[PDB]
Design a protein around this ligand. Structure first.
Ligand SMILES: CCN(CC)c1ccc2c(C)cc(=O)oc2c1
Ligand SMILES: CCN(CC)c1ccc2c(C)cc(=O)oc2c1
Ligand SMILES: CCN(CC)c1ccc2c(C)cc(=O)oc2c1
Ligand SMILES: CCN(CC)c1ccc2c(C)cc(=O)oc2c1
Ligand SMILES: [Cl-]
Ligand SMILES: [Cl-]
Ligand SMILES: [Cl-]
Ligand SMILES: [Cl-]
Ligand SMILES: [Yb+3]
Ligand SMILES: [Yb+3]
Lengths: 494, 493, 494, 493
């Protein structure tokens, strides 16, 4: 099957990365990092806090100064540095996939084939934009010459989640750097290791010091310090809606820093009677169960037209019973662990609520073993809108299936949530596909597929699933600050 | 459907240059006719090379750096276009009546479709005038680079007889919104509505020389435009054959920019899963609208075998319900062809269909004692090598063909030098997307046909055209890009 | 030419406007509205509070529903409705200019010639965008058809200041409606009247009920209710940086509503020795003194190169002594009153601090007259960076003039502020104009002019002067929510 | 400046079709020369109509719906272009050496400028491949409308001899990034570097038929491209005279789309307040770079009266510092003209200057015993009616003229059928903006000259061109817009 690392993974990078150098935490404190499949400690990482964030921000600010190498180099050269970084990640693909799998509880085949490929491709996409970011010339009323500059914003604080550590790192730094910003990155406490390896590559690629700085640490300490910092121009955060609210609040209270948020969801699928049933079953399944359900876009409410509901459930249950739980580095394993005990506990609790509230348990419904954080793939049918499992983001391998008869009513039910990250629509009918996708209050709507994400398209939430968009052309806007320059002239001509 | 309460009086018949009326330099005039009755409506000044030359000088002068048209706010060019739209709206009854009478165009369509299209298109174009923007560009090196999307200059615009008013606006709207000046040559058959619009251009307050209108013939006035050494751009809508000559003359003269919207032989592909009545109705509309006199006519309808016989049957039933007569007469649902030359060409192609073994299902000859009426005609069992399957007919003549293989029918649909438009009829998402992607056609309609709007670009693939008109994209063709690159001591992102 | 209203202005619209009908406040309470030139009470206006906001939001939500007239009408028809509204405002231009002047303390000639013309032109500009808002088709990796929809966001709460009540009303509703949103508008407590007249014209134009709702009232009541409302999708606010922070905070705490802010400034001008001196004096003067200094963009720090400093001051003082203070409806008056007693007091307090801290008072420096809130046009020279008058936004007719010798240093001084709304650069040199304007941390930089604002160009702040941009092509983005639709297909072709 | 350590061995001399090397159909070959020495470097297969026909069939096949090139990810087209850039970088010494030897091009410029420009341009184009996007459009009525910016198809690309490698990349980069297939005809004088690049195109992994290269003459292979019935678009850089013939043949044949980058007679306007040394230096570079063999050559320098004499003085001093010889020889700063026909034409124009009374300040004749060397030549007191003021020289011949009235000199600068570029030298903001706005030129440089980059669009006004190359805007010309309009039951905003 796939290539593997022929030598044992040695963890080398564990410190705070500022000005292209490695730093101990100011306090001297360190924190442990674990393998969630085995509960073994992999290493200790420097514990960044407010004081470390402050150093990083000073370094990022200095690198952003007018006249600095990063501000004065050709846009095309920023692009070239990003392309070079992509090449380096490609070179270290085995190492990074192995590290990502070990630290993140992520199936190795997925880490190698999906995550690493996504990283490389996304970086290369971003590189291409650097010298194609353009302002406007504007035919303003009066005798004036008016143009706009789409400048970088400045120092961007970027807070990265644990579910796709490498991919999310690139999703953030790629556009930020392509646009000419400098960054202070705070990877998730659970998964700092791949980010720190990437930092070694950032130095190797030749980025000027201070352009990228990485501060491992906890949310309420390092993350909060970023969000309330008086010299950070922008914060980007991916994670829970609850923390998203606190970031936005702290931005308002501190220096009115710009904010982009990619938060939770409770994304619905609507499966019409005319759908290709196998395709719908398969995508809805993938949509819920990919990476042990640990995706913001998880297809966590599947609404199925009455006449095909029983068959849909049956095929979904068959598909869910085929998994082999274990160490994600082990060939033959097809489901890894949840990231940590807190997530594991929360998932089991929500599964209990489902049983208690009268959802029909079709398979799974409990833990698997004591070692690491494994949850049996679980399917609930006859789920109703008022159940906790129908309302709350689970972030685990738990599928909810519901029936509908009225299309108008099921669109209302799909939209009746504060969330709005994504949705899926399954039908062969042109008119239905277009009109349903238009009516759904979701940032991405998939038609006859699910979970198809690419660097070329903008991604983000409606309502409380997010503020702003990442990637594609549109996502680049959020890493620029627009300046209008209006020059008096003696006479204009069209 | 309001009507004109008074008899239409023809007032504007001369050459319009510098907001004034001129006789032709030669003194010659030409007659203009009502194609339904064959009566002569009036005589119009016959513009030729010398008249074109006067118009071009006027347009050039109005385009000079420092002139009112060059120095006014872009928003004010917009205001002028909006005002022109309001004036056309005010004169809607008059214009629809004139368009109907001169053009052989059903009054209800003239009033409800052509005039509305005109007004809406002008208002759309008006809105772009101060939203045309260049770029600032992060060039390598210590430089500040920007672009200006300037007007091109003097644009010669040659307009056809089938949609005289709409096509006039389709041309002048974007040209003027972008800040060009124009020299317009309306079709010999249908100059009258354009000359009325010229009176409104003056009333609206456009500076003199910004719009000039020179009626006359193609080989004289039209050729003079295309070979003129001080015209920066020519735009032409008409036959592919004349399109070729325009492009050639452009190359030979001063390398003027060229946009062309030419003929078609547009196919429809009707799959077995299609809503059959919807397909029959849109394919029917697609071929028979305005007596078949549309570049986009749905002139090859390919129908999957299993529904072919029923499709033909319903199409024939639909085609036998027309009432032929004067397009000003309420209850008439098919007018005349524009003139005797077209009429003759259409009857000749109908004859070729009979001769080459197509099945004549209805119609197939002329109608009546006066004017140029052709019976609505349906041919079935048409094959790809027949003249009626290859040549643009421009008459009320429908061709229906069968297919069994989707892959093969796409090849057949694409096997033409034309490529203006096409239609796809199916309920299936995948088929709709993949078929529309595979068709070599500038506009592809799905479960409809002939849906045109000012918001979307329109134009041909292959020999159906060069460039696009309208929408955001169409505006590009009326601008000339200038890059300005300024040395600076040091740049910052 | 200056036509006037031939009849006495009769105040007719004083109620809350919801669903194209006039409503009393839920509480029954009303508040007085004044003429700041005379201190006389013009009328009483219904005092909207949380409960009134709630009714307005329900109306706006209902009008935004999928399948509603506002959602299903042609984009071009939204545009037509906006153009029609512009025509109606043009029809009522005398009435509106008179009302704006009387209620706002705004010079009639400026109200009629500038504000009303700006309103009409802005609306017409926005109308033209309605059917030119476009998404993308995107050549995503894999066998997919991807497109985007630039949908309206939904219910937009819009909070308008008292300095340009009509112009700011249009600046907000024009783009919001052009994009297809519905709105709940809260005009300033001081100046609700012109907005309520515009509401009558919104109804007359034929906008569907609930598309535009207007709730007069106070900031901490009605304004706070908007900013914390759980069913408002977006809030836009123009006003003080202090309130801006509270809005952003409440957005974060409530439902993560999108936020745009246009806040204060302390905008600098930099006048080089090679500048056209009369032009620079005139524009810097206009920049500070326009509408009694009551502009967010006021040119409130003028830095002048040493060799021309004394002459600059002299000419500035001569220019400032030519005003005639009085009722802004009186022909010949060239300076009106400040909006209210609170502003008046604040301005006089800052003028006192200037004297006290050792700025040189060149002219003015105190109040004027027996009625209304008049402040003498005041010029301070020898201002230094640590003085209150150099740091705090004054919002009155108070000009600060300072000297510099080093261009590098003065750029630092210009940038050394949390503000960043705008700036001015005065020089004949190409290189200086480009490199200085690039270096300044300001949203709009004027070269050899000042205060040139148009609907065609984006406008907004860097740093704590704002979040986002208003108007131009770019400003429209902030009133759309991007939806990506990705459709599985059997095979794609380029 | 690294150099090639081994002797250059010429390996690729054949026609490149379907990633294979072909002999000419006729069997004929043509010689290729070193212009510095007149020695024959090799013989190259002489492509003609029949070879063009094979190449077009290969390109057409590679463009078919469902082919690898049509179906691959846009990002993968980009990757292939990036890989090609890496391979050119690997072979930089070889390519620079070959370009210098065959093109008479100074080695340092070949290595530092041409090769770097090639690599950077390709990398720029690569980045656009997956960023080419259409639109979704809020059309009136119950419809869903979107556009596809498709590749056009088979693009014939005719390349000049002055910048063989750079111009090759300028053409194929955007064409391929957009998804087209190409048939490339390099200049008869300079086919060798293109054929080496073809080997790299294969090595990079482009599918067969995506790029085809047919060496040969203009009136044979070039004319066959321009009149071919299955080529969708032709792009040509070269003389205005041939440009006209290409456009004419396009019109006569199949109405293929046309982009042209032609000659110029580009003016500079130097104001009294200019940084004089900067202006002298850039105007000098502008006219003398690559022995004056640039379409954008700054061939009319208008200088304000009060600084005219000094401008001339400094220009003459600058022109007298060259060392003429073999462009591979270290220390040489001026190479030969490309061939005898150019050499003769240049000397003839220099004679006309003397005859018509221009003041010869330096140079004015040939140099050396072998190869086509012309002394760097400066004329002052040039007037607008002289041949040297009107005709494109394409040699190291500088024309300097005086003006007093700015309004008048703008008219003089604009009084030409050409309009490729211009330069404006001033420190004044207002002058810089208003003069650049008033000039009828595609690129206007302010306080610099000849600053070209892949990020900015480039092309001519008037008879200096049709369309733009490079930048965002240049990509439009390698796409064909398709509007797809789908009927739906009800739309929502
Ligand atoms: C999940 C742990 N918690 C407690 C609510 C928090 C609280 C606040 C933050 C902030 C401001 C940033 C962060 O990254 O993580 C957090 C985490
Ligand atoms: C239809 C009559 N014919 C003869 C082919 C022509 C020939 C040439 C032209 C040209 C160049 C322009 C034109 O408008 O009409 C023509 C008409
Ligand atoms: C005028 C100052 N104050 C009172 C503290 C406030 C405070 C809060 C708001 C909010 C949230 C919205 C507003 O419109 O006005 C305010 C005004
Ligand atoms: C410059 C030599 N000549 C004149 C015979 C030509 C003539 C025509 C062409 C054409 C059509 C294409 C070409 O590439 O070169 C030519 C060169
Ligand atoms: Cl912009
Ligand atoms: Cl551009
Ligand atoms: Cl988008
Ligand atoms: Cl488009
Ligand atoms: Yb008769
Ligand atoms: Yb006080």
């Amino acid at each position: 099957d796939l290539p593997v690392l022929l030598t044992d993974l040695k963890i080398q990078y564990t410190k705070i990365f500022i000005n292209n150098e490695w730093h101990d935490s100011v306090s001297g404190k360190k924190f442990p990092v674990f393998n969630p499949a085995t509960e073994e400690e992999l290493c200790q990482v420097e514990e960044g806090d407010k004081e470390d964030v402050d150093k990083a921000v000073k370094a990022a600010r200095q690198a952003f100064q007018i006249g600095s190498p990063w501000r004065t180099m050709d846009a095309s050269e920023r692009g070239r540095l990003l392309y070079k970084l992509a090449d380096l990640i490609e070179r270290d693909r085995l190492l990074l996939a192995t590290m990502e799998s070990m630290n993140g509880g992520k199936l190795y085949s997925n880490a190698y084939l999906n995550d690493l490929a996504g990283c490389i491709k996304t970086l290369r996409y971003c590189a291409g934009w650097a010298d194609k970011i353009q302002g406007r010339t504007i035919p303003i009323d009066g005798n004036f010459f008016t143009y706009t500059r789409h400048e970088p914003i400045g120092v961007c604080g970027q807070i990265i989640p644990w579910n796709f550590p490498l991919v999310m790192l690139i999703w953030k730094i790629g556009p930020a750097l392509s646009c000419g910003n400098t960054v202070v990155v705070k990877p998730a406490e659970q998964t700092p290791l791949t980010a720190l390896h990437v930092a070694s590559l950032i130095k190797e690629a030749g980025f000027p010091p201070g352009v990228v700085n990485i501060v491992p640490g906890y949310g309420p300490t390092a993350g909060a310090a970023i969000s309330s910092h008086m010299d950070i121009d922008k914060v980007a955060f991916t994670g829970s809606t609850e923390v998203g609210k606190l970031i936005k609040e702290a931005a308002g209270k501190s220096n009115l820093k710009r904010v982009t948020l990619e938060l939770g969801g409770k994304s619905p699928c609507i499966v019409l009677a005319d759908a290709d049933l196998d395709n719908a079953v398969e995508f809805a399944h993938h949509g819920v169960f990919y990476h042990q359900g640990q995706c913001c876009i998880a297809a966590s409410r599947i609404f199925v037209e009455e006449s095909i509901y029983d068959e849909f459930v049956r095929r979904s249950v068959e598909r869910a019973k085929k998994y082999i739980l274990g160490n994600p580095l082990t060939p033959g394993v097809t489901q890894g662990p949840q990231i940590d005990k807190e997530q594991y506990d929360k998932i089991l609790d929500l599964i209990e609520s489902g049983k208690k509230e009268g959802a029909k348990l079709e398979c799974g419904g409990g833990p698997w073993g004591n070692k690491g954080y494994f949850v049996q793939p679980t399917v609930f049918s006859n789920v109703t809108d008022e159940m906790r499992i129908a309302k709350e983001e689970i972030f685990g391998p738990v599928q909810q299936i519901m029936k509908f008869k009225s299309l108008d009513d099921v669109i209302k039910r799909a939209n009746n949530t504060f969330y709005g990250l994504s949705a899926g629509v399954f039908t062969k009918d042109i008119d239905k596909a277009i009109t349903i996708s238009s009516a759904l209050q979701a940032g991405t709507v998939w038609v006859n597929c699910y979970g198809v994400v690419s660097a070329q398209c903008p991604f983000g939430g409606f309502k409380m699933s997010g503020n702003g968009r990442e990637l594609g052309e549109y996502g680049f806007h959020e890493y620029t600050e627009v300046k209008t320059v209006t020059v008096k002239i003696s006479q204009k001509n069209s």
